[model samples]
Target: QQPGEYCHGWVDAQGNYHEGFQCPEDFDTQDATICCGSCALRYCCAAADARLEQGGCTNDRGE
Candidate 1:
């Protein structure tokens, strides 16, 4: 599923299951952007597997 403009997969490298959506990893693949939809709808799946692996992702952006 696609959630967040370009995120997919319910599973991450840390083996976390989101049940819906997560961050995007291979921008190479997910660039299917028009620009895409939610994180749950992007590519195949297990997309988190890529994010957790090479995720510079931060929750403390203080946005």
Candidate 2:
């Protein structure tokens, strides 16, 4: 998964994949930026598990 890019949806901290073409309005710019991962020619963002922890579109480990 790529960071700050479009995708089918977002992957929550709990590792649950939410389906959506865009991030929720409640999502802040930073969260939207880091969370969104590009997929299927569609774009989206991924919310980091924790602000203090290191994470990206791939996951906390930056996979």
Candidate 3:
């Protein structure tokens, strides 16, 4: 639950989802739709996917 740490929702060590383990910054019941650990994880995954699609390569040719 640290900053920039990758987590697939509020998961346990066994990969089981648990609301109790959610990071505070990522989860707020007041804004249920957007403020949740799962939401952030999904957002991060989508962003990574988009970046890869945009040619974010491991080995650049020149420029």
Candidate 4:
């Protein structure tokens, strides 16, 4: 099973990093872990739960 965590994006087999939706489906298969945040944050900056499947986070925070 895939681990539940805040996801920003995925990496390709060529050791490349892409934003949340820039990478293709095929290229995403090579990497299972999500990328970190862009700014000063470590992971997804949104107030999301530990699991992305939950589908919601802090409304005030505004993803």
TM-score of each: 0.20, 0.24, 0.17, 0.22
Consecutive 10-residue window with the lowest summed lDDT within model 1: 54-63
Model 3 residue 54 lDDT?
A: 14
For candidate 2, the C-alpha RMSD (Å) to the true structure equals: 9.5
The local lDDT score (0 to 100) that residue 24 gets in candidate 1 is 38
lDDT of each: 0.35, 0.40, 0.29, 0.35
User: For candidate 3, what is the lDDT?
Assistant: 0.29
Q: Write the per-residue lDDT of candidate 1 for residues 22-46, one digit (tens) a residue.
A: 3334453553333232333334334
Clashes of 1: 13
Give the per-residue lDDT digits (tens) of candidate 2, residues 1-63: 544433335456666665643343344454565323332222333455422222234432233
Top candidate when judged by lDDT against the true structure: 2
Model 3 misplaced regions, further than 4 Å: 1-9, 20-63
lDDT of 2: 0.40
Clashes of each: 13, 12, 0, 0
Off by over 4 Å in 2: 1-8, 22-56, 59-63
The list of candidate 1 runs beyond 4 A from truth reads 1-9, 21-63
Q: Which residue pairs collide in model 3, if any?
A: none
Candidate 2: count the clashes: 12
lDDT (Cα, tens digit) per residue for candidate 3, span 1-63: 234322233433455543322222354332222222232222222233222221222222212
RMSD value for candidate 3: 13.5
